[PDB]
DNA sequence: GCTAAGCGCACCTAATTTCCTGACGGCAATCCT
């Protein structure tokens, strides 16, 4: 059972996502230039979003004997906790380390600032950083983890680190051909001078674009993840739409605030993954008639309609849910009637989803 | 022999390094001698049986250049760092260029039949040889940088004139 | 390549009133105004029966529009990246030059009816500067070619090797 | 709680912001060309507005040294200052720093401190130096804006140890994008020799290019991090609210307007109070086509009120509810004629809108917040 | 304090302002074609009126080497004046200094000749020359339309230091749009040979091109800089102001008004109060439509008094009152026929209307700041 | 049932300066004992 979404979003000129010479991301895509946004940062955005504060519940730090050592009020233990970590594996303030919060907090601390011995105390730490994998966020992302086999001792050994992700993310690429923007920035001096010149000259790179958005949930993984409690699993879910619906990537965003909400979004339920992206092969060009975001809808729905008519399946029947603010912009403008549900709020979405995925609404499962 | 499938950090893989086992030979026994050289080289890292080739080189003797045939003596070197060096960066931590890393090989192989001439250099040399690169190098600068702009045929360009600058020991 | 010299002879010998109906009718299309249409129906309509080497309608209507605003002689050798490029070499290497070279390289990225502003701003540096001539019909039949990738390679190198004398 | 400003500008022809070679601001906002506004011109426009003038005391400057000397007085020591800007990791060119410095300006008197200590030593004076500055963040523009401060590593002090000196940003602004299709002119000026001569002919002869154009500026200020920079003064984070307000409606940027005085009001501000960051600049993606018997702005208002429909539909009905208030000048440009309830209050006022905004945050005469300022 | 001035004026068919083709200037407001002056042509034609002459101090020449060479004595201009200003930072380019220089007329060119006049050397003679250049700062235009003179540092010598040449401008001019959609109008003209040596002929055939239009003219005069410009002198500043509000009505722009005479006086003048600047432009983003029983300019001077009604009834009606006077001639065009004290004062005449305006700024009669200057 | 010649300008000038950031972060296994 596959969960798919397909978001198109049109955003204000910005630079959402840079490289290392600060330049806007781009693909080569059917032969052209292709503005794009990483799936990294798309799930740090989903990750870091208010809507999913109440379900965030995993860390990815170094640093984890500063974490230790901030339940102790009195209670100094930061070199031994670097060492029991350096014993672990870790070589060095370490390699990066993802488990659970709580986990670390009240477990590390009933383990490693316990006075006992010292290997088997290093490998309590590694049975407890690699059996804490109980996050949503840590079962939507995924992970492994390796320690350096030359600084861990030979007594020490680790169990499976391998939580396999149940969330794949495509990078935003653009529906239209890539426009590369530079900004001419200065920075005039707040005292005054006798040259009246600027105190820093540079340029800045921005692209305005509308992105096609990509996102796959396997919920036999999802619940294989997070164990037995599907309400998690379900709040999970519900969380992640709201947070893809209404969170953007915290690029420049505070010299380019482009928080624009996607005009579409189809969540599509099926045993396959469906990349719509070859919809948008042929460039889109504009028009006189019509706009941007109605051309790519219609590109879209044209593909959509050539799927399904094509690539199909009587054993299984594909089925979404069309979204679009107040019905603005219809999906099947000409003759493309796919869409049967066509719905015109986000919380009315996520109620048929939630319904589809089984017997759970969105205020039963606020509560995991 | 320095061979291994293993591309590590520190190691590009090339070819049958033919190139390895000169400054030594050429030096102390056997030396300078009109004949034909048959290089055996099992490849092993303790008992991992990597690999085994052998070549023949023609030679007369002609002479010995010291530091040109010590340089020989290690292409691994110079060819691990071209293919550490990045399309645009700094960092030595990186892969560098892998699609260089492909096109390595055929230019060795290329380079490595007359493997005589580049040994006592009659008229073959390090330059004449890496000169070889150029096609393999144009061709993979087109895939690098396949824009029709000014800035890419200048990046192209730059990526043209790269060949492994030797070193001393 | 017949029907293009001709097009450029027409366009130098229109008038001043009928280049400054070219010049209003800049930033927009021709289905809003009308002597904008009738100009390039009087202007197009002719030359495409009489020849079937016409220049494609929306590239003709560009460089219509280029030539109203901007107004240099056709002369021959004097294409886009031999006098930028040229002018190119008078410029500070290390900020200046490569703004200018972005501002002429983003034109190697748009499609035919968003290009005239680029455009516009190389030929405002052209104007700068002042250039009297361009090669009005090499820019037209290579613009008109724009489907390629070895014209775009060829203009490019033609501005590398205008750059490297 | 977050305070969105959602502005619609109708501006006079005019080059507001313009990069290196001249041309105004232009971008592409969805496959069309659109005239743009980059956000620290209103950033600036803003801060250095006479509504804004209280809530000043951000100084950024690579002449600190400067400042210092002038605060110290007639006791000269500006060698001193910076050989301790030196040794702090702001490496001196010629007379500036080599890196701009963002501090509060009623700390410099602590700078002058340190500098004018004749007891203390070189080190010790540039920790001192450091933390005053680390700790010059009282400022309501610097709260607003945020600050970066690295030092340079390579010319510091091994006996240099610097704190946070990162403050977040509690004010987002969006770049003002056109809301029909943009095209700039290019104005022929010439420049008149006064002197007759016998050339007859100009003094100079040159290419300005102007645009007019009606802009939506976005503006999105945090509440709560707007008061945590200011270490929990309420009073003054509802006093740069309102200036803030003040200065994003009366202030324009200051860009050639001695050639183009386009001093024009906003035409419609709708003021919303919501939790998450939302912006309708995608009310725009299709330009504005103006027909006779409508208008641009009219045009405008209509597509915007259409989107803030749509999403406040789709998007916004839940427990938490969105209050938006409208206002336009007297009434004269109301929103969407198809519902006529959008807004939960058609302001027709702008000092009755900023009471009604100051009225929601916690409840705030104008009177009792302006006797609170930080200089 | 902040004067501001808007201004309706219907010009007659002409072509007052044009690009290098000839085409009239235009500009797109609203979405549509409007007729535009510019704002430097207004600023010139103010300059250059017969009331605003007792105030033309300034020159803003690239041939400030003749201006020097003017005394009897003829031994100046070749060597003294030429490398002495190619020294400052000003080359030649066939006997002319390529910067233009604004500064002041007579005091500085009477003082900048004493440098030119033998002894003391080079390298310090320029220094004396940009003192005084850099110092000038003295007229009233200079502090209307402000000041630079940044010379080249390539030629000059790095014994020469210059002090700060920036005056800041005291006037805001904006651009003449129109109140309808623009009418492009091509007039064409055929020059008549009066010699019958041939067949009837012409000459010489072409097109000009022309257009009329309702202007509505911006202007904003800050009261302090301008104080501050003239260094105190608050005679001179209120003199300027009567003088450009004088200019600003009695003179129209300098284009071909030989064969396009559009000598049109405005037949309305609001002017304003206040201490922060707006523009009335927003009234005319729906371009007026001429009905049957009325005239543009009614229709246009009612459309400004309801975004005039607007802007006051939504910004500010308490503390800061904006004070308000209404000028039409002899009372023809009322500022709207609905609710009324919308101005202040509708003042029937132009001469009162300065005198109000003066009043205002402070009790300077016309009189004695005809005296300043 | 609907005409036709001849006539369509070129000269002048196109500008200067100065400022252009810093530090931080760069992973490990496992492919013969």
């Given at each position: 059972?596959?969960?798919?979404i ?60 500063d ?11 930061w070199?031994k ?6 014993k ?10 993802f ?34 994998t ?41 529906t ?93 339920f ?14 889109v ?53 796919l869409?049967?549900?066509?719905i ?25 | ?26 030096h ?57 060096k ?41 330059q ?33 004139s ?5 070193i001393?020991? | 390549?017949?029907?293009?010299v ?160």
């Open positions: 059972m596959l969960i798919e397909h978001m198109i979003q049109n955003h204000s000129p910005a630079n959402l996502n840079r490289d290392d010479l600060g330049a806007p991301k781009t693909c080569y895509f059917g032969g052209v230039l292709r503005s794009r946004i990483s799936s990294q940062c798309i799930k740090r955005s989903i990750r870091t979003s208010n809507d999913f504060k109440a379900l965030l519940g995993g860390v990815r730090t170094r640093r984890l004997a974490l230790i050592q901030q339940e102790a009020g009195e209670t100094e233990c070199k906790a670097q060492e029991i970590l350096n672990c594996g870790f070589k060095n303030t370490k390699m990066l380390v488990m659970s919060k709580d986990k670390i907090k009240d477990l590390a601390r009933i383990v490693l600032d316990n006075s006992l011995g010292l290997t088997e105390a290093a490998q309590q730490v590694a049975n407890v950083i690699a059996q804490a109980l996050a949503p966020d840590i079962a939507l992302c995924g992970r492994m983890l390796e320690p350096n086999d030359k600084d861990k001792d030979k007594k020490v050994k680790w169990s499976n680190t391998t939580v396999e992700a149940a969330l794949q993310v495509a990078h935003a690429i653009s239209h051909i890539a426009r590369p923007e530079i900004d001419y920035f200065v920075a005039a001096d707040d005292v005054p001078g006798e040259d009246a010149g600027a105190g820093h000259i540079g340029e800045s790179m921005f692209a305005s674009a509308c992105f096609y958005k990509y996102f796959s949930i396997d919920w036999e993984q999802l619940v294989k993840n997070l164990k037995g409690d599907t309400n998690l699993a379900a709040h999970t879910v519900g969380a992640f739409l709201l947070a893809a619906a209404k969170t953007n990537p915290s690029g420049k965003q505070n010299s380019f605030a482009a928080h624009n909400y996607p005009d579409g979004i189809l969540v599509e099926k045993n396959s993954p469906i990349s719509y992206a070859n919809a948008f092969v042929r460039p060009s504009v028009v006189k008639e019509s706009d941007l975001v109605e051309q790519s809808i219609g590109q879209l729905s044209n593909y959509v309609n050539d799927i399904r008519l094509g690539y199909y399946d009587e054993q299984s029947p594909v089925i979404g849910f069309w979204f679009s603010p107040n019905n603005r912009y219809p999906l099947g403008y000409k003759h493309s009637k869409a049967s549900r066509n015109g709020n986000l919380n009315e979405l996520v109620g048929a989803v939630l319904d589809y995925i089984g017997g759970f609404k969105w205020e039963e499962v606020q509560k995991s | 022999s320095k061979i291994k499938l293993m591309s590590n950090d520190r190691y590009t893989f090339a070819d049958r390094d033919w190139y390895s086992p000169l400054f030594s030979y050429l102390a026994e056997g030396n300078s001698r009109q004949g034909k050289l048959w290089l055996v080289g099992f490849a092993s890292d303790k008992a991992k049986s990597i690999d085994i080739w052998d070549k023949i080189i023609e030679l007369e003797g002609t002479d010995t250049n010291d530091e040109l045939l010590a340089q020989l003596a290690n292409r691994a070197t110079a060819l691990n760092a071209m293919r550490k990045p399309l645009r960066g700094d960092f030595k931590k990186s892969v560098g260029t892998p699609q260089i890393a492909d096109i390595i090989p055929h230019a060795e192989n290329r380079i490595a039949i007359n493997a005589g001439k580049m040994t006592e250099n009659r008229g073959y040399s390090w004449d040889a890496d000169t070889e690169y150029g096609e393999l190098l144009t061709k993979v600068a087109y895939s690098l940088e396949p824009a029709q702009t000014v800035d890419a045929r200048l990046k192209r360009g730059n990526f043209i790269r060949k492994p600058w030797p001393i020991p | 390549n017949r029907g293009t001709d097009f450029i002879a027409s366009l130098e010998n229109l008038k001043e009133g009928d280049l400054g109906i070219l010049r209003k009718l800049r930033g927009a299309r021709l289905d809003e105004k009308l002597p904008g249409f009738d100009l390039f129906s009087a202007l197009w309509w002719p030359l495409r029966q009489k020849n079937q080497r016409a220049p494609k309608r929306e590239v003709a209507w560009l460089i219509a529009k280029l030539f109203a605003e901007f107004r240099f002689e056709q002369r021959e050798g004097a294409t886009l990246p031999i006098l930028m490029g040229g002018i190119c070499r008078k410029l500070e290497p290390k900020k200046e030059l490569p703004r200018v070279l972005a501002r002429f390289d983003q034109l190697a990225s748009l499609d035919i009816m968003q290009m005239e502003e680029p455009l516009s701003v190389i030929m405002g540096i052209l104007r700068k500067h002042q250039q009297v001539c361009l090669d009005w019909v090499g820019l037209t039949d290579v613009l008109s070619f724009w489907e390629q990738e070895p014209v775009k390679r060829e203009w490019s190198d033609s501005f590398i090797k205008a750059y490297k004398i």
